[PDB]
């Protein structure tokens, strides 16, 4: 059949091809997501779960309130949806809506990082001890890997030395 056209077909084409080929799905968000995540590349290191629980996650999303929503974490997507809302409902420009929503994203992330530091600090004031921090653990693993490199280097180094005796 004639597949669904997700974008206006080229009106200039006189002899169009691939009429029975499904078209690409492009939304207005795609453009915004690309812009934001390019301005915040390290926002991709924040793990994001794409495993739907029941699919009823878009029923409690009201972007008129703010970035924080029920069921979804605070991520770049919330900024884009919030941006799109302001741009459409409040008749804002792409840049204007981008600035407002983006700035709210920062303040929410700042408190999150402040809690971690104040949490561990205050916890020790009353006799609270924790495990190995991620920094220490990371360094330990490098030791085990660096030592393995030393062995390989020593062997190959000796190999070349023995291989150099044959040149003469």
């Amino acid at each position: 059949p004639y597949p669904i056209q997700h974008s206006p077909p080229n009106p200039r084409a006189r002899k169009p091809r691939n009429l029975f080929r499904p078209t690409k799905i492009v939304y207005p968000e795609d453009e915004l997501r690309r812009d934001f995540y390019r301005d915040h590349p390290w926002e991709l290191a924040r793990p994001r779960m794409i495993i739907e629980l029941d699919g009823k996650d878009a029923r409690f999303l009201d972007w008129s309130k703010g970035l924080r929503q029920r069921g979804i974490p605070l991520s770049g997507e919330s900024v884009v949806q919030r941006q799109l809302w302001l741009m459409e409902n409040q008749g804002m420009t792409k840049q204007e809506a981008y600035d407002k929503a983006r700035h709210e994203f920062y303040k929410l992330r700042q408190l999150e990082q402040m809690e971690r530091r104040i949490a561990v600090e205050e916890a020790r004031m009353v006799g609270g001890y924790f495990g190995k921090d991620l920094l220490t653990v990371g360094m330990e693993l490098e030791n085990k890997t660096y030592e393995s490199w030393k062995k390989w280097a020593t062997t190959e180094i000796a190999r070349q030395e023995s291989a150099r005796a044959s040149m003469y």
């Binding site: 799905i25 915040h40 590349p41 290191a45 794409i50 495993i51 999303l61 420009t93 530091r117 991620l134």
Partner: protein, 372 residues
């Protein structure tokens, strides 16, 4: 008019996956390796997680369940998907802990990001209502444009000779007509200035004669012209008559979404000793010793230059695990290329001793035993 099934996919979690952004820009003329590639400056793909129960089944909300050999066992479940379904009918994925945990490490240093300063240290926050601004208006004067960080036009000094020619013949050349109109608006306001003033004690902006003559008056003062041309093409100011002009505008946000702390003007109150002077030290590695006219050190996953100062001089195979020294991160910033450059500064002796005490590996306890 969208169908109900099509309305659910728009808001689905999978459809939210951001497009693969271009990799960290490097020198256009180098000898990069093809078969083997090392970790990138900043992440390019979205990192994913799952529940402990769904991970034991290989379910990651993807096309198919991933294998359990390399996906289970680790503490932090992180994975990157290059292609949800490749030509081999397999989800081409790879571990995402390289960048996922590096962000957590950097966020454990508790250090904000500040705009670089030319060489009186002034660490100004990046998230401010005066500098961090992208939207603008045409009526805005040139001065405020320096504050901005996201320019639409390219950086001339950075562009290669080939890219420059293409830009001229595909972005600048087909804009003369529009540029002429831009001048008319300026000349129009100029006629209103005198009128408004004299009235205390705008025109239709259609004058094709003054425009041509107006540009002949600016041929002796090229400075004011470029100042005007920069506004019509949104070019980053280059000449001092300044900010991030040495390496150009930052391709990304000055913070690059790695840390959202505004300032570090706090004093971590230690339980026993009390409010400390400086921040807790951090142990770092030694890479590429001096004996290359500089030493590289690995501070929490990132590579930075060694402090301005044994250990750095020569390599020592006897040292097991490599040379590891304690050091305090003073200042962190993002360059134009997107790298996270750290101003690593030598740490103190007491700070290390205090910090090791909690770890339990301090040889001598300052508390109590220390008589002096």
């Amino acid at each position: 008019g969208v169908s109900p099934g099509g309305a659910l996919l728009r808001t689905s979690r999978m459809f939210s996956l951001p497009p693969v952004i271009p990799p960290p820009p490097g020198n256009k003329l180098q000898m990069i390796s093809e078969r083997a590639s090392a970790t990138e400056a900043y992440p390019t793909h979205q990192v994913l997680t799952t529940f402990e129960s769904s991970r034991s089944r290989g379910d990651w909300g993807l096309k198919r369940p991933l294998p359990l050999k390399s996906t289970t066992g680790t503490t932090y479940p992180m994975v990157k998907v290059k292609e949800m379904d490749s030509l081999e009918q397999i989800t081409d994925f790879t571990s995402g802990t390289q960048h996922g945990l590096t962000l957590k490490k950097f966020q454990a240093l508790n250090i904000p990001i500040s705009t670089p300063s030319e060489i009186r240290p002034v660490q100004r926050s990046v998230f401010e209502a005066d500098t961090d601004v992208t939207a603008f208006s045409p009526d805005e004067q040139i001065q405020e444009a320096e504050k901005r960080w996201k320019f639409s036009g390219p950086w001339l000094a950075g562009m290669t000779p080939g890219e420059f020619k293409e830009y001229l013949a595909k972005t600048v050349r087909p804009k003369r007509a529009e540029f002429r109109k831009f001048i008319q608006k300026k000349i129009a306001a100029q006629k209103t200035e005198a009128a408004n003033r004299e009235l205390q004690e705008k025109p239709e902006s259609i004058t094709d004669d003054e425009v041509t003559e107006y540009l002949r008056r600016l041929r002796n003062d090229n400075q004011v012209l470029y100042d005007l041309v920069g506004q019509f093409l949104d070019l980053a100011p280059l000449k001092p008559p300044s900010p991030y002009g040495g390496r150009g505008p930052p391709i990304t946000h000055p913070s690059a979404g790695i840390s959202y702390l505004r300032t570090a003007a706090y004093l971590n109150n230690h339980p026993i000793y009390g409010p400390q002077k400086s921040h807790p030290p951090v142990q770092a590695r030694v890479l590429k010793p001096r004996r290359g006219n500089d030493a590289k050190i690995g501070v929490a996953g990132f590579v930075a230059d060694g402090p301005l100062g044994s250990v750095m001089d020569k390599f020592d195979p006897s040292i097991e695990g490599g040379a590891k020294l304690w050091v305090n991160v003073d200042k962190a910033t993002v360059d134009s290329t997107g790298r996270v450059q750290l101003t690593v500064s030598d740490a103190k002796a007491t700070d290390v001793l205090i910090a090791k005490e909690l770890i339990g590996d301090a040889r001598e306890p300052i508390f109590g035993s220390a008589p002096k």
